[PDB]
Amino acid sequence: MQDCGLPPDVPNAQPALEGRTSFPEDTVITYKCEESFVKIPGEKDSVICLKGSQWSDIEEFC
Numbered sequence: 001m002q003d004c005g006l007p008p009d010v011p012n013a014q015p016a017l018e019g020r021t022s023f024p025e026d027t028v029i030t031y032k033c034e035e036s037f038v039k040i041p042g043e044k045d046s047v048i049c050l051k052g053s054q055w056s057d058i059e060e061f062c
Contacts, residue, residue, distance in 0.1 A: 012037045012062040013045075023049050033062035046047035 004023045007015050013031035023029070030046040033039050043061035050056055 001053060004053050005056055006057060007047050007055050010058055010062075011060050013060070015047075025049050025051065029055075031058070031061075037062040 002025050004025070006021060006025065007017075007023075007029045010031050010033050011018065014030050014034060015031045027049040028046055029048075031043075038043055040061050043057055045061050047058045048056045
């Protein structure tokens with residue numbers, strides 16, 4: 001369906017979901033590093049809901 005489920009689990013980061021569990025195609029979700037963690041400059045900190053109900057890849061960035 002034209003919707004993705006929960007975004008991937010990134011270690012030491014938490015996504016901002018704004019109170020929802022389902023996201024429409026092209027939805028961009030940004031992660032914030034957890035306490036005692038700082039984002040690594042020049043790294044992706046968000047994912048996007050693409051076709052097939054699949055999220056784009058994201059690597060640990062904290």
